[PDB]
Design a protein around this nucleic acid. Structure first.
Ligand SMILES: Nc1ccn([C@H]2C[C@H](O)[C@@H](COP(=O)(O)NP(=O)(O)OP(=O)(O)O)O2)c(=O)n1
Ligand SMILES: [Mg+2]
Ligand SMILES: [Mg+2]
Length: 430
DNA sequence: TCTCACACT
DNA sequence: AGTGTGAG
């Protein structure tokens, strides 16, 4: 009763850019706007691999991971933009710079956790408290929430999309207790007001549209965000959780999309997140471990405590390239040339990073994959990163891996290399 | 057929 | 440390 925590202590949002790399290319090239289009990497093999898809193209069935030649069979008028290539490899600079534009705007509203190139969590608890004081128990107008869905509503005793959205929003607002500044539902609603303002600022100042989720924790905010993408935001209240989870496949929850989620389904013989409530915490810890078990017990009730970490910048800066099939690297000079290419990109990124962000990397991680190996990495080794110098980095990288060459013949390399990866890690202030 | 964070040991 | 999972 009075002592059962409900996980309603924070207001957390997740903002995720819509078809992000496509919007970056559409802003640059107006001819791609409002068209079925996709962003591809590496044009020579089957037209390139698609990594992002506009919503117009998604209507034709175009998806990420399709070859463009194959996407063209579904959507013959599909337009394409190519990722820049530098030093023989895809170069993601344009998208990293565009990400910084967005993350800097979000940071004006609250400390953010950068979760990926195109999304960030926000802890809005303090901002909401501030705004509630300013509001002075005065009602929240639907006009302040023009792109907000309230998950689960309308419900109870119109056939158009926007009509339903308004109907649900009206039911929600009509039920709100605005004279109680500690009401979690009211706190979420003020959170949604702030997120409308944030999303409007991002669109005004960059041209990019995004979606967002507002709830009491990161997992629910992420789940919420995807419910009404694109260009809308979704509020998932604590009360909405039982119905929402009652038919929600386990794999849809962040961190349960892989082997762990598959094991939950298999071991327990369930399908939906809500079905987890029937197990004791000890039962869950017995199957999935102390940490996962406690997390699952709380999460299936809508409760999660993972903090929004104050981190706006990536913790590592890495450069990698695959050399699949018959392209695997088989000579010393080949391996040395490509390590050098990677090291040169890394140096460029590291130097820019040190000037912008007042920090230096101190460890260089080198990873390879040898042909035949079914693992994503064969060998991983680290060494000291003492100077931002590509020739030194590439020579050092070769040293920590040169004993992998099982060829007595010095010039040849065996087994051939199907992947090289260099990553700068362990940053210190500078 | 290119990235980045984090748990385990 | 090095290996692996999970995700954008
Ligand atoms: N496997 C992946 C997933 C994403 N990305 C890139 C391209 C995406 O535009 C960008 C953001 O990923 P995303 O949020 O999963 N999808 P995207 O923003 O394109 O579409 P939405 O579904 O969010 O509207 O990361 C990638 O290069 N490889
Ligand atoms: Mg996105
Ligand atoms: Mg995303």
């Amino acid at each position: 009763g009075p002592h059962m925590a409900t996980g309603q202590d924070r207001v957390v949002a997740l903002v995720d850019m819509d078809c992000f790399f496509v919007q970056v290319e559409q802003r640059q090239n107006p001819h791609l706007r409002n068209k079925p289009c996709a962003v591809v990497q590496y044009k020579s093999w089957k037209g390139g691999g698609i990594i992002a898809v506009s919503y117009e193209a998604r209507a034709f069935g175009v998806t990420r991971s399709m070859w463009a030649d194959d996407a063209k069979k579904l959507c013959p008028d599909l337009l394409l933009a190519q990722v820049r290539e530098s030093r023989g490899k895809a170069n993601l600079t344009k998208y990293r710079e565009a990400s910084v534009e967005v993350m800097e705007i979000m940071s004006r509203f609250a400390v953010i956790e950068r979760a990926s190139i195109d999304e960030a969590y926000v802890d809005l608890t303090s901002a909401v408290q501030e705004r509630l004081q300013k509001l002075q128990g005065q009602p929240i107008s639907a006009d302040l929430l023009p792109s907000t869905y309230i998950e689960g509503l309308p419900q109870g005793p119109t056939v158009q999309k926007e009509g339903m959205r308004k109907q649900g929003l009206f039911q929600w607002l009509d039920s709100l207790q605005i004279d109680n500044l500690t009401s979690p539902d009211l706190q979420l609603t003020v959170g949604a007001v702030i997120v409308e303002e944030m999303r409007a600022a991002i669109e005004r100042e960059t041209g990019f549209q995004c979606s967002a989720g507002i709830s009491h924790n990161k997992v629910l905010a992420k789940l919420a965000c995807g419910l009404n993408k694109p260009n809308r935001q979704t509020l998932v209240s604590h009360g909405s959780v039982p119905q929402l989870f009652s038919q929600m496949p386990i794999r849809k929850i962040r961190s349960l999309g892989g082997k762990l989620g598959a094991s939950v389904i298999e071991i327990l013989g369930i399908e939906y997140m809500g079905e987890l409530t029937q197990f004791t915490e000890s039962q869950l810890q017995s199957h999935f471990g102390e940490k996962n078990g406690s997390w699952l017990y709380a999460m299936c009730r809508g409760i999660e405590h993972d903090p929004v970490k104050p981190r706006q910048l990536p913790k590592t800066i890495g450069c990698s390239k695959n050399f699949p099939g018959k392209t695997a690297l088989a000579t010393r000079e080949q391996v040395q040339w490509w390590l050098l290419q990677l090291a040169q990109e890394l140096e460029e990124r590291l130097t820019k990073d040190r000037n912008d962000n007042d920090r230096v990397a101190t460890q260089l991680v080198v990873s390879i994959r040898v042909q035949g190996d079914k693992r994503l990495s064969s060998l991983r080794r680290c060494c000291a990163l003492t100077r931002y110098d590509a020739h030194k980095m590439s020579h050092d990288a070769f040293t920590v891996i040169k004993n992998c060459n099982t060829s007595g013949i010095q010039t040849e390399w065996s087994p051939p290399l199907t992947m090289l990866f260099l990553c700068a890690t362990k940053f210190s202030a500078s």
